[PDB]
């Protein structure tokens, strides 16, 4: 065949998004979890199966202890990551990696060891002709079809912010903020406890993740919505657990995403996500700032909450000069924007010479990641 | 929610209209004051030139 | 209905603000031009007086 | 075609003014800047474009470091000048220089190497039938339509002064004074710092150049205007930066052009521009001085400030015998006076025999500039 | 008692150095931090205290959020600064400002409001008979006992360069370079994340400052030292956190001070400390360059790293004419030279007639600072 296709995988924490390069959507999207039978089984003709990977672990949740292998964009456990990639290629996509070049995404300001060990596994585990590791935020920018913007990337791993102008990139102005979907989940199960609902274990920690994926929203003013929580009507929502227990969540619902704009609630000094965007834009040159204000791109899974775009717009407009208009461009489909940006990149004809070849790795070693790529 | 936001955006767009119109009126007063002071500067200039 | 009305009132109040903004912007251009001619007439006057 | 037209270029520092000879205005006027991508770009399908030339560099300012290739009428960097001329001919005028004789302007008391290397490039870079290098001040005098005057030429490059009488010219009485638009810009960004506004880089150095091109004016008495700066009203002006930041400049505004009349502010002993004009007129013969006092011509870009003509008139009248009347003739359009003087010269029928031919250069070498022309 | 004595206070960003005049060493040295308690405390009998100042903030660090009030030589908040001066006078020194003339140090090319508000706080908050504000670099020259030299002065504030010749000063040849030791602290925490060491709050930001002031050094040639960092040995050093976490840092350690000589690393076009020193010397008159090259003086807090003098000598010798011998005098004790320079200056009886008196302030108001001093 011509061009050989190519393969693209996004592994921020929480979800593997994977598929062929040259398509508009990934074939396989599943949770990045390795769930181990904690309870010793007593039957004959079970499994045994040392561990379960992917949405198999979601189905068989109650037995398992679940371990996310990626925390804060950092792989904690390498064998668990290899198992997840083994699951992507053989269980879903049914590809031999020898037949495809593979793009990986990776997060900004990330330890060198993750990029270098990630390449070491791609060459010396799944034999592969070529690969690339690319920055998450630039891929979302490509997916949005814009040449310029400040990309606010927040996954389940960590939050990142990369300003770009006309292509280029500003290394000093790149900001990484330790907040995530996962930290909002840990805050959320903590704020459910005051209501009497106690979720203590990894299995129902993913149940509050599912709650937060739909019930939670961001206030267009926090204090105003917290004041109208005195007359509870629309702010309460009934939620059904898989147990058949019913949960009723009021003001507790919208103050969980409020943590992004008030990290004093989590107990971290690190500024809210709108001030981090100001911190990135202020580090940029005076000239370009006009379009960075007007071309803010949201990406990732934890920018999905209803009303985030409006809240960021009101806060950035309030802080900034009202001399210029602050447009925020946050697409629906923004969850998959990194993977789509990886699809478009590996489909680019020129990019087919910028691959890290297997040959170039075999001569010059794993350290060449940083030398060739950003 | 679209209503509380559309209504609050209305109260703020009405407030922005109130402020923009307050600025139209406050500016219309200032424009007229600079026009009147300009006429006076021009009259004083015609007087100074004479 | 309260939303479409809040949105229509919002588009209308946004237009009250946009028209009041167009008027204030017209007046801001007039203040800048007339006050610039106030200062130029005042400078021409200062020049005529000097 | 008859007469072949001719081409005219003024390159004092700061601006290329270029067009056809035989027209009242130049087609192309743009900043003489070579701006290089200082920041390494990270995208695919950019440029690359090693450098940007002309008002392209003004548009894409923030990325670039900008280098003026001409300083003090001296070309610092020759490849950068060749690139600027390559841009004039191909990007704007769309001419083959083989089809046109080319006039260049050049400044008085200027190193021989600039004239000789300038001719060497015109013949052996852009193949051309003929060329001429001419003095800036005489061209402005032609443009003003007068046979006699003392031409005060001040560009962004250097300040020059050439007395002329009935044509002729006085070599001993020619004065060159190291002040310019550019030195006023360096003074200006230094005098903004006491107000808290700090412009540290080449990109916003051209922003204070733009400020000074409109806000700045010359006091009809410096001390009187500095005294009335106690009651700040009309002396302050709001200025808008491209950032959306607002700058408010009071007495600082008019004391920047005051440096021309007080080079003790810059720290140079070299006399103010009115005493340099006296120094030129005093070196002239007694008989002609009467009309040189009454026929002072201002030219160049840094004689554009409002009130320069009045200040020069008051100072020269104060120093000189009040026995004779000191008329200063400073036209509006005085910025382009050198180019218009070059247009009229190459349109002159007799001048069409005084060209340096390509043939005469090929036989007698680059040194013949000084031998044939002034 | 005769003279009464006087008080001298140095308050560049990062460190207060303060004490009596004519004492050769100070009487208080402590960090210029105001530390407010971010976390609400739940006990009875605590404090409470609005804030902790100086080393109480260093000691109780993890509860707090720490604010420097002085950023880039500019006072960003004035209650925080007043508290620092209140703390020096009443806790360590134990004096009444009513007894003592007070000398304050101040930075080259600083907004007028810093002098004008600083004199107001000294006259109207802490009642004082007389005071003075003095330029930092001239004081460090006084400490090393010299009449002539070029002073490179750099704190955790900003980097300033002042050339001086037989006393005097050249205002047009004074250079300010906005690179501080503090920007090196932010660069150091940014580089540490490559090795996986994520530090994010102000408390451990001062742990990287503590790493910076004794593990870091300047490479005697950068590429040579970075090449031998392939074979890690003496280039790696263990470090102990007050946590008990061990931190091992390598090439990272010397490429942090390299940012002073390569500002491309922090993303700024602004030339290096060797190049800015050359820029000052080129602005200076032709004769005095001979002695300025051979009388380079280093002062301040971020000139303390090993190898700075040695490197500045290689880079200035390479750029300058080698017809004269470049000599740098970078004494030990150079962190305190600005204070020592003030303690000698306030001990000069002729300078006791050069004070700004309380009566002159009461008669003629805050603006008189720039009418009597620099």
Which SS3 state, helix, strand or coil, does residue A310 take? Answer: helix
Write the residue in D196, D200, D267 that is nearest to E270 by C-beta: D200
At what angle are helices A78-86 and A112-124 packed, to 10 degrees? Answer: 50
* CB-count burial class (<10 Å; 0-12, 13-18, 19+) for A145: exposed
Structure tokens at E359: 């009566």
Task: For residue A265, give both structure tokens.
Answer: 């609630």
Chain D residues inside the 8 Å CB shell of A350: 44-45
Pick the closest to residue D56 from D78, D80, D32, D20 (CA basis): D32
10 Å Cβ neighbour count for E201?
A: 16
Calpha distance D145→D341 (Å, rounded): 9
Q: Does the beta-carbon distance from C50 to D220 stay under 8 Å?
A: yes
**CA D339 to chain CA centroid, nearest Å:** 10
**Intra-chain end-to-end CA distance of chain C, in Å:** 68
Report how far apart, in Å, the C-alpha atoms of E362 and of each of A275, A301, D280, E112, E118 are. Answer: 43, 63, 52, 19, 15
Search chain C and give the residue with CA nearest B36.
C38
Q: What's the number of CA atoms in the CB half-sphere (13 Å) around residue E366?
A: 13
Phi-psi region of D29 (alpha: psi -120 to 50; beta: other; left: phi over 0): beta
Q: How far is B7 from chain A (nearest CA, A)?
A: 12
User: Which positions in chain C have a beta carbon within 8 angstroms of at least one beta carbon in chain B?
Assistant: 2-3, 6-7, 9-10, 13-14, 16-17, 20-21, 23-24, 27-28, 30-31, 34-35, 37-38, 41-42, 44-45, 48-49
- Helix (H) / strand (E) element for D297: namely strand D296-299
- End-to-end CA separation in angstroms for chain B: 68
Q: What are the distances in angstroms from CA D33 to CA D68, D97, E113?
A: 5, 22, 36
Tell me how far apart the alpha carbons of residues D211 and D225 are, in angstroms, rounded to a whole number.
19
Say whether residue A318 is in contact with chain B using an 8 A CB cutoff: no
Query: To 10 degrees, what angle do helices E308-319 and E273-283 make?
Result: 50
Strand partners, A132: A103
Provide, as residue numbers in chain C, all residues whose Cβ is less than 8 Å from the Cβ of D220.
47, 50
What would the two tokens of residue D52 be? 């940007």
Q: What is the structure's resolution, reported in angstroms to one decimal? A: 10.2
> Cα dist. E80→A66, E32, E87, E97 in Å?
49, 9, 11, 19
CA distances from E164 to D92, D341, E150, E172 (A): 49, 47, 6, 12
Spell out which residues of chain B touch residue C17, defining contact as CB-CB under 8 Å.
13-14, 16-17, 19-21
Residues of A in contact with D204 (CB under 8 A): 286-287
The half-sphere exposure of E167 on its side-chain side, counting CA atoms within 13 A, is: 1
**Which residues 6+ apart lie within 8 Å of D125 measured at CB?**
D82, D85
Q: Using a CB-CB distance cutoff of 8 angstroms, which residues of chain A are in contact with residue D243? A: 286-287, 289-290
Residue D38, CA atoms < 13 Å, CB-side half-sphere: 25
Q: Specify the 3-state DSSP secondary structure of D96.
A: coil
Chains B and C touch (3+ CB pairs under 8 A): yes
Write the residue in C3, C41, C42 that is nearest to B3 by C-beta. C3
Do E125 and E150 form a contact (C-beta atoms < 8 A)? Answer: no
- E strand or H helix at A121: helix A112-124
Q: How many CA atoms, within 13 angstroms, populate the side-chain half-sphere of residue A125?
A: 17
Give yes or no for a contact between E254 and E218, defined as CB atoms under 8 angstroms apart. Answer: yes
Quote the tokens at residue D269. Answer: 């002993």
- Find the residue in B nearest to A311 (Cα): B5
Q: Can chain D be said to touch chain B, i.e. do they have 3 or more Cβ pairs within 8 angstroms?
A: no
Give the H/E segment covering residue B25.
helix B2-49
> The tokens of A22 are what?
């040259």
In E, minimum Cα distance to A111 occurs at: E194
Please give the sequence-ordered ranges of beta strands (E in DSSP) within chain A, or none if there are none: 7-10, 15-20, 28-31, 34-37, 52-53, 64-67, 70-71, 74-75, 102-106, 130-135, 149-154, 159-164, 175-177, 237-240, 246-249, 296-299, 328-329, 356-357
Q: Report d(CA E145, CA E344) in Å as an integer.
A: 10
Mutate to test the interface with E, among A109, A110, A111, A366 (most CBs of E within 10 A): A111
Q: How far apart are CA D224 and CA D236, in angstroms?
A: 16
- Measured between beta carbons, the chain C residues lying within 8 angstroms of B34 are 31, 34-35, 38
What is the C-alpha to C-alpha distance for residues E162 and E298, in angstroms, rounded to an integer? 11
Smallest CA–CA distance from B12 into chain A, residue: A314
Point out the residue among D193, D194, D267 whose CB comes nearest to the CB of E172.
D267
CA-nearest residue of chain A to B2? Answer: A307
B-chain residues within 8 Å CB-CB of C3? 2-3, 6
Q: CA–CA separation, A7 vs D41, rounded Å? A: 26
Please, what is the end-to-end C-alpha distance for chain A in angstroms? 30
Residues 7-46 of C with CB under 8 A from D: 39, 42-43
In this complex, whether E and A touch, counting 3 or more CB pairs under 8 angstroms, is: yes
**CA atoms of E214 and A86, how far apart (whole Å):** 47
Q: Rounded to whole angstroms, how far apart are CA atoms D231 and D237?
A: 14
Query: Between the CA atoms of A85, A91, A96 and A97, what dihedral angle is there, to the nearest 10 degrees?
Result: -20
Chains with ≥3 CB–CB distances under 8 Å to D: A, C, E
Contacts of A271 in chain E (CB under 8 A): none
Cα distance between residue D214 and residue D253, in whole Å:
10
- Kindly write down the DSSP assignment for every residue of A216-277, as one continuous string: ----SSHHHHHHHTTS-SSS-EEEE-TTS-EEEESTHHHHHHHTTT-TTTTT--S--HHHHH
d(CA D43, CA A166): 9
CA distance E212 to E67: 19
Task: Dig out the tokens for C45 from the structure.
Answer: 């006057």
Q: Are E51 and A255 in contact (CB under 8 A)?
A: no
8 A C-beta contact, residue D276 and residue D292: no
């Amino acid at each position: 065949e011509d061009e050989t296709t190519a393969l693209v995988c996004d592994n921020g924490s929480g979800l593997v998004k994977a598929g062929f390069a040259g398509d508009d959507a990934p074939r396989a999207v599943f949770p990045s979890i390795v769930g181990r039978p904690r309870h010793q089984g007593v039957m004959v003709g079970m499994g045994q199966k040392d561990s379960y990977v992917g949405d198999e672990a979601q189905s068989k949740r109650g037995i398992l202890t679940l371990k996310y292998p990626i925390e804060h964009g950092i792989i904690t456990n390498w064998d668990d990551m290899e198992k997840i990639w083994h699951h992507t290629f053989y269980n879903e996509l049914r590809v031999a990696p020898e037949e495809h070049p593979t793009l990986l995404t990776e997060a900004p300001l990330n330890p060198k060891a993750n990029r270098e060990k990630m390449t070491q596994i791609m060459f010396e585990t799944f034999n592969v002709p070529a690969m690339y590791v690319a920055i998450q935020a630039v891929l979302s920018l490509y997916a949005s079809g814009r040449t310029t913007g400040i990309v606010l990337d927040s996954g389940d791993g960590v939050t990142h912010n990369v300003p770009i102008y006309e292509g280029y990139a500003l290394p000093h102005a790149i900001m990484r903020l330790d907040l995530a979907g996962r930290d909002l989940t840990d805050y959320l199960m903590k704020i459910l406890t005051e209501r009497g609902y106690s979720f203590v274990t990894t299995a129902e920690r993913e149940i509050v993740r599912d709650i937060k994926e739909k019930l939670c929203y961001v206030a267009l003013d926090f204090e105003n919505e917290m004041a109208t929580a005195a007359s509870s009507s629309s702010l309460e929502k009934s939620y059904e657990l898989p147990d058949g227990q019913v949960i009723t969540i009021g003001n507790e619902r919208f103050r969980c995403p409020e943590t992004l704009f008030q990290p004093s609630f989590i107990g971290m000094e690190s500024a809210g996500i709108h001030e981090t965007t100001y911190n990135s834009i202020m580090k940029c040159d005076i000239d370009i700032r006009k379009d960075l204000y007007a071309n803010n791109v949201m990406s990732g899974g934890t920018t999905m909450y209803p009303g985030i775009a409006d809240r960021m717009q009101k806060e950035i407009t309030a802080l900034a000069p009202s001399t210029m208009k602050i447009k925020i461009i946050a697409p629906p489909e923004r969850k998959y924007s990194v993977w789509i940006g990886g699809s478009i990149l590996a489909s680019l004809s020129t990019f087919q010479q910028m691959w890290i070849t297997k040959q170039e790795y075999d001569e010059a070693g794993p350290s060449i990641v940083h030398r060739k790529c950003f | 929610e679209a209503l509380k936001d559309a209504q609050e955006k209305l109260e703020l767009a009405e407030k922005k209209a109130t402020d923009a119109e307050a600025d139209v009126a406050s500016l219309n007063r200032r424009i007229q004051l600079v026009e009147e002071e300009l006429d006076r500067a021009q009259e004083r200039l015609a007087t100074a030139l004479q």
